[PDB]
Amino acid sequence: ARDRSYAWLLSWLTRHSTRTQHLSVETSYLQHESGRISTKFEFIPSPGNHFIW
Amino acid sequence: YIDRGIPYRRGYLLYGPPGCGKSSFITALAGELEHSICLLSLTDSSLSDDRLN
Amino acid sequence: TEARIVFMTTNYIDRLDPALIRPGRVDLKEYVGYCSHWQLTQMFQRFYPGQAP
Amino acid sequence: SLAENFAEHVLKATSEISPAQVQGYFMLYKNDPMGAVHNIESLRP
Ligand SMILES: Nc1ncnc2c1ncn2[C@@H]1O[C@H](COP(=O)(O)OP(=O)(O)OP(=O)(O)O)[C@@H](O)[C@H]1O
Ligand SMILES: [Mg+2]
Numbered sequence: 001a002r003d004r005s006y007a008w009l010l011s012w013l014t015r016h017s018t019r020t021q022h023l024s025v026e027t028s029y030l031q032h033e034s035g036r037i038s039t040k041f042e043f044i045p046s047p048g049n050h051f052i053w
Numbered sequence: 054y055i056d057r058g059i060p061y062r063r064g065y066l067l068y069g070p071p072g073c074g075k076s077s078f079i080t081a082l083a084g085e086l087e088h089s090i091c092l093l094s095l096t097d098s099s100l101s102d103d104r105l106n
Numbered sequence: 107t108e109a110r111i112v113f114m115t116t117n118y119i120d121r122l123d124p125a126l127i128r129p130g131r132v133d134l135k136e137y138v139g140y141c142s143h144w145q146l147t148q149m150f151q152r153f154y155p156g157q158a159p
Numbered sequence: 160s161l162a163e164n165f166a167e168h169v170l171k172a173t174s175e176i177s178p179a180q181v182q183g184y185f186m187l188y189k190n191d192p193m194g195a196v197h198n199i200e201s202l203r204p
Contacts, residue, residue, distance in 0.1 A: 029107075037109045071125040072179030129183035
């Protein structure tokens with residue numbers, strides 16, 4: 001966790017996780033193009049063993 | 054810069070009465086140059102000389 | 107961050123630095139002062155509803 | 160010509176006007192150029 005590589009790899013794991021069903025939630029505020037902000041429900045793979053292809 | 058030994062660094066200073074467009078111009082310039090902004094707070098509590106370097 | 111409304115109050119406006127209250131940090135300054143004739147009339151009418159004006 | 164008139168009137172009324180104050184003044188008169196060009200005197204210090 002001491003490397004920026006950790007941040008980039010965590011982001012890539014969040015994006016490319018196929019249909020992984022062992023996720024964890026991460027709430028963030030996303031500013032829409034209309035000018036307002038709404039809650040964004042983002043799912044990060046929860047701790048465990050996940051398999052990709 | 055390399056061919057003359059000069060360090061490859063540059064710094065800019067914008068000064069004037071408040072509300073005249075320094076921060077807004079910096080944001081616009083960062084947008085134009087497709088750069089990002091690293092906000093540094095000198096008057097912090099965890100900031101030391103070695104940490105600043 | 108955008109989409110944000112900030113309300114600030116004070117009793118001594120002369121103690122506020124002009125950079126803190128400027129058109130872009132505080133977009134509206136209003137004075138809430140002592141009672142006036144109309145204000146007293148409305149307060150009386152609200153506290154004792156039914157009496158003659 | 161309206162922009163030139165507005166600039167001249169603002170410079171005549173006040174001597175040191177910051178762009179933030181001009182932005183706020185325009186914020187008051189949204190979609191009303193004539194109101195902006197009319198009520199310069201409200202900007203007097
Ligand atoms: N030249 C300008 N053109 C357009 N908008 C401006 C200009 N100068 C200031 N503003 C507006 O004023 C507000 C605040 O300006 P800004 O933050 O750039 O001021 P500043 O002088 O850099 O002050 P500070 O250093 O305290 O941030 C914003 O709404 C910004 O759009
Ligand atoms: Mg600034």
